[PDB]
Amino acid sequence: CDAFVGTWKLVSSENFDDYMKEVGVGFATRKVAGMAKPNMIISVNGDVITIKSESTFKNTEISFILGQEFDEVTADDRKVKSTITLDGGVLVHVQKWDGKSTTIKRKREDDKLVVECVMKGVTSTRVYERA
Ligand SMILES: Cc1c(Cl)cccc1OCc1cc(=O)n2nc(-c3ccccc3)nc2[nH]1
């Protein structure tokens, strides 16, 4: 995961409100979450990867081993079963809850870390650069 490790700042967002709607996030949480622009930190220690926020909305921190399911409480307070794998150089994060599923892909492209959040047919793209 070397090219992912670091501190990343949000530079652009498209369709994130629509993504959150499709996920089922309520109005007030969408408004506050949509404004929040924390930097996102990826660190690695051995086989354990950590993804952490620093948010004005809600701080989060997940630690995991690739391929191994874990419990995650998302920023919008869903309790999900998550699995994150590294597929062709892309981190692929699947969240399962209440019979539903969403996938978040994170990939390096040029000097960007591009996050693609997909819920059914809705995709949001959020672009980060090194802080
Ligand atoms: C905030 C939120 C709500 Cl309320 C609801 C559903 C999904 C959400 O976030 C999903 C989501 C949005 C986003 O901007 N990022 N940025 C990263 C990222 C960027 C660089 C390095 C590591 C991780 N991961 C995500 N995941």
JSON list of C-alpha atoms and ligand atoms in Angstrom, two decimals:
[
{"chain": "A", "resi": 1, "resn": "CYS", "atom": "CA", "xyz": [0.00, 0.00, 0.00]},
{"chain": "A", "resi": 2, "resn": "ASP", "atom": "CA", "xyz": [3.01, 2.38, -0.23]},
{"chain": "A", "resi": 3, "resn": "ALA", "atom": "CA", "xyz": [1.57, 4.86, -2.82]},
{"chain": "A", "resi": 4, "resn": "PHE", "atom": "CA", "xyz": [-1.49, 5.27, -0.60]},
{"chain": "A", "resi": 5, "resn": "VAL", "atom": "CA", "xyz": [0.23, 6.01, 2.68]},
{"chain": "A", "resi": 6, "resn": "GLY", "atom": "CA", "xyz": [0.07, 9.64, 3.72]},
{"chain": "A", "resi": 7, "resn": "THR", "atom": "CA", "xyz": [-2.19, 12.56, 4.57]},
{"chain": "A", "resi": 8, "resn": "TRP", "atom": "CA", "xyz": [-4.69, 13.55, 1.88]},
{"chain": "A", "resi": 9, "resn": "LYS", "atom": "CA", "xyz": [-6.78, 16.68, 1.44]},
{"chain": "A", "resi": 10, "resn": "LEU", "atom": "CA", "xyz": [-10.03, 16.92, -0.44]},
{"chain": "A", "resi": 11, "resn": "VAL", "atom": "CA", "xyz": [-9.83, 18.95, -3.62]},
{"chain": "A", "resi": 12, "resn": "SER", "atom": "CA", "xyz": [-13.12, 18.24, -5.42]},
{"chain": "A", "resi": 13, "resn": "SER", "atom": "CA", "xyz": [-16.41, 16.37, -5.05]},
{"chain": "A", "resi": 14, "resn": "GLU", "atom": "CA", "xyz": [-19.16, 15.34, -7.46]},
{"chain": "A", "resi": 15, "resn": "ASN", "atom": "CA", "xyz": [-22.49, 13.74, -6.65]},
{"chain": "A", "resi": 16, "resn": "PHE", "atom": "CA", "xyz": [-21.71, 13.08, -2.99]},
{"chain": "A", "resi": 17, "resn": "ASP", "atom": "CA", "xyz": [-25.12, 14.31, -1.78]},
{"chain": "A", "resi": 18, "resn": "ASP", "atom": "CA", "xyz": [-26.78, 12.04, -4.30]},
{"chain": "A", "resi": 19, "resn": "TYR", "atom": "CA", "xyz": [-24.66, 9.12, -3.16]},
{"chain": "A", "resi": 20, "resn": "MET", "atom": "CA", "xyz": [-25.58, 9.74, 0.45]},
{"chain": "A", "resi": 21, "resn": "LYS", "atom": "CA", "xyz": [-29.27, 9.97, -0.50]},
{"chain": "A", "resi": 22, "resn": "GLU", "atom": "CA", "xyz": [-29.06, 6.62, -2.24]},
{"chain": "A", "resi": 23, "resn": "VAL", "atom": "CA", "xyz": [-27.34, 5.09, 0.80]},
{"chain": "A", "resi": 24, "resn": "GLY", "atom": "CA", "xyz": [-30.21, 6.39, 2.98]},
{"chain": "A", "resi": 25, "resn": "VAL", "atom": "CA", "xyz": [-28.48, 9.16, 4.88]},
{"chain": "A", "resi": 26, "resn": "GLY", "atom": "CA", "xyz": [-31.00, 11.67, 6.29]},
{"chain": "A", "resi": 27, "resn": "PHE", "atom": "CA", "xyz": [-31.16, 15.34, 5.36]},
{"chain": "A", "resi": 28, "resn": "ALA", "atom": "CA", "xyz": [-29.41, 16.85, 8.42]},
{"chain": "A", "resi": 29, "resn": "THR", "atom": "CA", "xyz": [-26.57, 14.37, 8.38]},
{"chain": "A", "resi": 30, "resn": "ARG", "atom": "CA", "xyz": [-26.10, 14.89, 4.64]},
{"chain": "A", "resi": 31, "resn": "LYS", "atom": "CA", "xyz": [-25.88, 18.64, 5.10]},
{"chain": "A", "resi": 32, "resn": "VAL", "atom": "CA", "xyz": [-23.31, 18.50, 7.82]},
{"chain": "A", "resi": 33, "resn": "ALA", "atom": "CA", "xyz": [-21.35, 15.61, 6.22]},
{"chain": "A", "resi": 34, "resn": "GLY", "atom": "CA", "xyz": [-21.36, 17.33, 2.80]},
{"chain": "A", "resi": 35, "resn": "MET", "atom": "CA", "xyz": [-19.72, 20.42, 4.18]},
{"chain": "A", "resi": 36, "resn": "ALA", "atom": "CA", "xyz": [-17.07, 18.52, 6.22]},
{"chain": "A", "resi": 37, "resn": "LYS", "atom": "CA", "xyz": [-13.73, 18.39, 4.51]},
{"chain": "A", "resi": 38, "resn": "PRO", "atom": "CA", "xyz": [-11.37, 16.55, 6.88]},
{"chain": "A", "resi": 39, "resn": "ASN", "atom": "CA", "xyz": [-8.00, 15.39, 5.68]},
{"chain": "A", "resi": 40, "resn": "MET", "atom": "CA", "xyz": [-7.84, 11.59, 5.34]},
{"chain": "A", "resi": 41, "resn": "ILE", "atom": "CA", "xyz": [-4.86, 9.61, 6.59]},
{"chain": "A", "resi": 42, "resn": "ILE", "atom": "CA", "xyz": [-3.69, 6.16, 5.48]},
{"chain": "A", "resi": 43, "resn": "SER", "atom": "CA", "xyz": [-1.01, 4.43, 7.51]},
{"chain": "A", "resi": 44, "resn": "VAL", "atom": "CA", "xyz": [0.38, 0.88, 7.49]},
{"chain": "A", "resi": 45, "resn": "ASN", "atom": "CA", "xyz": [1.97, -1.17, 10.25]},
{"chain": "A", "resi": 46, "resn": "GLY", "atom": "CA", "xyz": [2.85, -4.67, 9.21]},
{"chain": "A", "resi": 47, "resn": "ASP", "atom": "CA", "xyz": [-0.26, -6.16, 7.62]},
{"chain": "A", "resi": 48, "resn": "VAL", "atom": "CA", "xyz": [-2.60, -3.70, 9.33]},
{"chain": "A", "resi": 49, "resn": "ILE", "atom": "CA", "xyz": [-3.84, -0.73, 7.34]},
{"chain": "A", "resi": 50, "resn": "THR", "atom": "CA", "xyz": [-5.48, 2.22, 9.12]},
{"chain": "A", "resi": 51, "resn": "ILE", "atom": "CA", "xyz": [-7.72, 4.82, 7.45]},
{"chain": "A", "resi": 52, "resn": "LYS", "atom": "CA", "xyz": [-8.45, 7.78, 9.74]},
{"chain": "A", "resi": 53, "resn": "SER", "atom": "CA", "xyz": [-10.26, 11.13, 9.39]},
{"chain": "A", "resi": 54, "resn": "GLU", "atom": "CA", "xyz": [-9.79, 14.41, 11.32]},
{"chain": "A", "resi": 55, "resn": "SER", "atom": "CA", "xyz": [-13.37, 15.72, 10.71]},
{"chain": "A", "resi": 56, "resn": "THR", "atom": "CA", "xyz": [-15.61, 18.72, 11.58]},
{"chain": "A", "resi": 57, "resn": "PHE", "atom": "CA", "xyz": [-18.47, 16.28, 11.06]},
{"chain": "A", "resi": 58, "resn": "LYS", "atom": "CA", "xyz": [-17.54, 12.96, 12.70]},
{"chain": "A", "resi": 59, "resn": "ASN", "atom": "CA", "xyz": [-14.10, 11.49, 13.31]},
{"chain": "A", "resi": 60, "resn": "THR", "atom": "CA", "xyz": [-13.57, 7.95, 12.09]},
{"chain": "A", "resi": 61, "resn": "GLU", "atom": "CA", "xyz": [-10.82, 5.36, 12.26]},
{"chain": "A", "resi": 62, "resn": "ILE", "atom": "CA", "xyz": [-10.74, 1.88, 10.79]},
{"chain": "A", "resi": 63, "resn": "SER", "atom": "CA", "xyz": [-7.97, -0.65, 10.98]},
{"chain": "A", "resi": 64, "resn": "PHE", "atom": "CA", "xyz": [-8.03, -3.83, 8.96]},
{"chain": "A", "resi": 65, "resn": "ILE", "atom": "CA", "xyz": [-6.20, -6.59, 7.19]},
{"chain": "A", "resi": 66, "resn": "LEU", "atom": "CA", "xyz": [-6.83, -6.97, 3.45]},
{"chain": "A", "resi": 67, "resn": "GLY", "atom": "CA", "xyz": [-9.41, -9.66, 2.76]},
{"chain": "A", "resi": 68, "resn": "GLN", "atom": "CA", "xyz": [-10.61, -9.95, 6.36]},
{"chain": "A", "resi": 69, "resn": "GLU", "atom": "CA", "xyz": [-14.10, -8.81, 7.33]},
{"chain": "A", "resi": 70, "resn": "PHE", "atom": "CA", "xyz": [-14.46, -6.27, 10.12]},
{"chain": "A", "resi": 71, "resn": "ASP", "atom": "CA", "xyz": [-17.07, -4.25, 11.93]},
{"chain": "A", "resi": 72, "resn": "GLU", "atom": "CA", "xyz": [-17.29, -0.59, 10.93]},
{"chain": "A", "resi": 73, "resn": "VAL", "atom": "CA", "xyz": [-19.47, 2.21, 12.30]},
{"chain": "A", "resi": 74, "resn": "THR", "atom": "CA", "xyz": [-19.66, 4.71, 9.44]},
{"chain": "A", "resi": 75, "resn": "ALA", "atom": "CA", "xyz": [-19.66, 8.50, 9.74]},
{"chain": "A", "resi": 76, "resn": "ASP", "atom": "CA", "xyz": [-23.49, 8.48, 9.28]},
{"chain": "A", "resi": 77, "resn": "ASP", "atom": "CA", "xyz": [-23.79, 5.84, 12.05]},
{"chain": "A", "resi": 78, "resn": "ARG", "atom": "CA", "xyz": [-24.48, 2.72, 10.01]},
{"chain": "A", "resi": 79, "resn": "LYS", "atom": "CA", "xyz": [-23.18, -0.45, 11.57]},
{"chain": "A", "resi": 80, "resn": "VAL", "atom": "CA", "xyz": [-21.74, -2.33, 8.61]},
{"chain": "A", "resi": 81, "resn": "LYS", "atom": "CA", "xyz": [-19.67, -5.44, 7.85]},
{"chain": "A", "resi": 82, "resn": "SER", "atom": "CA", "xyz": [-16.73, -4.29, 5.74]},
{"chain": "A", "resi": 83, "resn": "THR", "atom": "CA", "xyz": [-14.15, -6.10, 3.64]},
{"chain": "A", "resi": 84, "resn": "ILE", "atom": "CA", "xyz": [-11.29, -4.25, 1.91]},
{"chain": "A", "resi": 85, "resn": "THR", "atom": "CA", "xyz": [-9.15, -5.87, -0.76]},
{"chain": "A", "resi": 86, "resn": "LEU", "atom": "CA", "xyz": [-6.42, -4.64, -3.07]},
{"chain": "A", "resi": 87, "resn": "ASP", "atom": "CA", "xyz": [-7.51, -5.51, -6.68]},
{"chain": "A", "resi": 88, "resn": "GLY", "atom": "CA", "xyz": [-5.09, -4.55, -9.43]},
{"chain": "A", "resi": 89, "resn": "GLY", "atom": "CA", "xyz": [-3.69, -1.76, -7.34]},
{"chain": "A", "resi": 90, "resn": "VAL", "atom": "CA", "xyz": [-7.14, -0.38, -6.31]},
{"chain": "A", "resi": 91, "resn": "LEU", "atom": "CA", "xyz": [-8.36, -0.55, -2.72]},
{"chain": "A", "resi": 92, "resn": "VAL", "atom": "CA", "xyz": [-11.91, -1.91, -2.89]},
{"chain": "A", "resi": 93, "resn": "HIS", "atom": "CA", "xyz": [-14.05, -1.45, 0.22]},
{"chain": "A", "resi": 94, "resn": "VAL", "atom": "CA", "xyz": [-17.40, -3.21, 0.42]},
{"chain": "A", "resi": 95, "resn": "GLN", "atom": "CA", "xyz": [-19.86, -2.37, 3.19]},
{"chain": "A", "resi": 96, "resn": "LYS", "atom": "CA", "xyz": [-22.84, -4.65, 3.93]},
{"chain": "A", "resi": 97, "resn": "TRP", "atom": "CA", "xyz": [-25.77, -3.69, 6.16]},
{"chain": "A", "resi": 98, "resn": "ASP", "atom": "CA", "xyz": [-29.54, -4.37, 6.28]},
{"chain": "A", "resi": 99, "resn": "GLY", "atom": "CA", "xyz": [-29.38, -6.37, 3.06]},
{"chain": "A", "resi": 100, "resn": "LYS", "atom": "CA", "xyz": [-27.78, -3.40, 1.24]},
{"chain": "A", "resi": 101, "resn": "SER", "atom": "CA", "xyz": [-24.27, -2.95, -0.18]},
{"chain": "A", "resi": 102, "resn": "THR", "atom": "CA", "xyz": [-22.04, -0.03, -1.16]},
{"chain": "A", "resi": 103, "resn": "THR", "atom": "CA", "xyz": [-18.55, -0.08, -2.60]},
{"chain": "A", "resi": 104, "resn": "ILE", "atom": "CA", "xyz": [-15.88, 2.57, -2.18]},
{"chain": "A", "resi": 105, "resn": "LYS", "atom": "CA", "xyz": [-12.84, 2.34, -4.46]},
{"chain": "A", "resi": 106, "resn": "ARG", "atom": "CA", "xyz": [-9.66, 4.30, -3.77]},
{"chain": "A", "resi": 107, "resn": "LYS", "atom": "CA", "xyz": [-6.95, 4.58, -6.42]},
{"chain": "A", "resi": 108, "resn": "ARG", "atom": "CA", "xyz": [-3.83, 6.60, -7.19]},
{"chain": "A", "resi": 109, "resn": "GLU", "atom": "CA", "xyz": [-4.03, 8.57, -10.43]},
{"chain": "A", "resi": 110, "resn": "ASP", "atom": "CA", "xyz": [-1.20, 10.97, -11.18]},
{"chain": "A", "resi": 111, "resn": "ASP", "atom": "CA", "xyz": [-0.74, 12.97, -7.96]},
{"chain": "A", "resi": 112, "resn": "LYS", "atom": "CA", "xyz": [-4.35, 12.33, -6.89]},
{"chain": "A", "resi": 113, "resn": "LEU", "atom": "CA", "xyz": [-6.01, 9.73, -4.70]},
{"chain": "A", "resi": 114, "resn": "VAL", "atom": "CA", "xyz": [-9.43, 9.30, -6.31]},
{"chain": "A", "resi": 115, "resn": "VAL", "atom": "CA", "xyz": [-12.35, 7.95, -4.23]},
{"chain": "A", "resi": 116, "resn": "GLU", "atom": "CA", "xyz": [-15.34, 6.50, -6.07]},
{"chain": "A", "resi": 117, "resn": "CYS", "atom": "CA", "xyz": [-18.38, 5.76, -3.91]},
{"chain": "A", "resi": 118, "resn": "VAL", "atom": "CA", "xyz": [-21.07, 3.62, -5.55]},
{"chain": "A", "resi": 119, "resn": "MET", "atom": "CA", "xyz": [-24.57, 2.81, -4.27]},
{"chain": "A", "resi": 120, "resn": "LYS", "atom": "CA", "xyz": [-26.71, 1.04, -6.86]},
{"chain": "A", "resi": 121, "resn": "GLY", "atom": "CA", "xyz": [-26.46, 3.17, -9.96]},
{"chain": "A", "resi": 122, "resn": "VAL", "atom": "CA", "xyz": [-25.17, 6.32, -8.21]},
{"chain": "A", "resi": 123, "resn": "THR", "atom": "CA", "xyz": [-21.43, 7.13, -8.23]},
{"chain": "A", "resi": 124, "resn": "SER", "atom": "CA", "xyz": [-19.72, 9.93, -6.42]},
{"chain": "A", "resi": 125, "resn": "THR", "atom": "CA", "xyz": [-16.14, 10.88, -7.19]},
{"chain": "A", "resi": 126, "resn": "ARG", "atom": "CA", "xyz": [-14.06, 12.69, -4.65]},
{"chain": "A", "resi": 127, "resn": "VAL", "atom": "CA", "xyz": [-10.53, 13.77, -5.52]},
{"chain": "A", "resi": 128, "resn": "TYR", "atom": "CA", "xyz": [-7.76, 14.14, -2.94]},
{"chain": "A", "resi": 129, "resn": "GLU", "atom": "CA", "xyz": [-4.15, 15.39, -3.19]},
{"chain": "A", "resi": 130, "resn": "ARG", "atom": "CA", "xyz": [-1.31, 15.17, -0.64]},
{"chain": "A", "resi": 131, "resn": "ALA", "atom": "CA", "xyz": [-1.63, 17.66, 2.16]},
{"chain": "B", "resi": 1, "resn": "LIG", "atom": "C1", "xyz": [-18.92, 10.93, 5.19]},
{"chain": "B", "resi": 1, "resn": "LIG", "atom": "C2", "xyz": [-19.73, 9.80, 4.63]},
{"chain": "B", "resi": 1, "resn": "LIG", "atom": "C3", "xyz": [-21.08, 9.67, 4.96]},
{"chain": "B", "resi": 1, "resn": "LIG", "atom": "CL1", "xyz": [-21.84, 10.77, 5.98]},
{"chain": "B", "resi": 1, "resn": "LIG", "atom": "C4", "xyz": [-21.94, 8.68, 4.45]},
{"chain": "B", "resi": 1, "resn": "LIG", "atom": "C5", "xyz": [-21.45, 7.70, 3.64]},
{"chain": "B", "resi": 1, "resn": "LIG", "atom": "C6", "xyz": [-20.10, 7.76, 3.27]},
{"chain": "B", "resi": 1, "resn": "LIG", "atom": "C7", "xyz": [-19.24, 8.77, 3.73]},
{"chain": "B", "resi": 1, "resn": "LIG", "atom": "O1", "xyz": [-17.88, 8.79, 3.30]},
{"chain": "B", "resi": 1, "resn": "LIG", "atom": "C8", "xyz": [-17.41, 7.95, 2.13]},
{"chain": "B", "resi": 1, "resn": "LIG", "atom": "C9", "xyz": [-16.05, 8.48, 1.72]},
{"chain": "B", "resi": 1, "resn": "LIG", "atom": "C10", "xyz": [-15.92, 9.74, 1.27]},
{"chain": "B", "resi": 1, "resn": "LIG", "atom": "C11", "xyz": [-14.66, 10.38, 1.06]},
{"chain": "B", "resi": 1, "resn": "LIG", "atom": "O2", "xyz": [-14.46, 11.55, 0.75]},
{"chain": "B", "resi": 1, "resn": "LIG", "atom": "N1", "xyz": [-13.61, 9.54, 1.39]},
{"chain": "B", "resi": 1, "resn": "LIG", "atom": "N2", "xyz": [-12.31, 9.90, 1.34]},
{"chain": "B", "resi": 1, "resn": "LIG", "atom": "C12", "xyz": [-11.69, 8.77, 1.71]},
{"chain": "B", "resi": 1, "resn": "LIG", "atom": "C13", "xyz": [-10.25, 8.67, 1.73]},
{"chain": "B", "resi": 1, "resn": "LIG", "atom": "C14", "xyz": [-9.45, 9.60, 1.04]},
{"chain": "B", "resi": 1, "resn": "LIG", "atom": "C15", "xyz": [-8.04, 9.51, 1.07]},
{"chain": "B", "resi": 1, "resn": "LIG", "atom": "C16", "xyz": [-7.42, 8.51, 1.84]},
{"chain": "B", "resi": 1, "resn": "LIG", "atom": "C17", "xyz": [-8.21, 7.61, 2.51]},
{"chain": "B", "resi": 1, "resn": "LIG", "atom": "C18", "xyz": [-9.60, 7.67, 2.46]},
{"chain": "B", "resi": 1, "resn": "LIG", "atom": "N3", "xyz": [-12.51, 7.68, 2.01]},
{"chain": "B", "resi": 1, "resn": "LIG", "atom": "C19", "xyz": [-13.74, 8.22, 1.80]},
{"chain": "B", "resi": 1, "resn": "LIG", "atom": "N4", "xyz": [-14.97, 7.63, 1.95]}
]
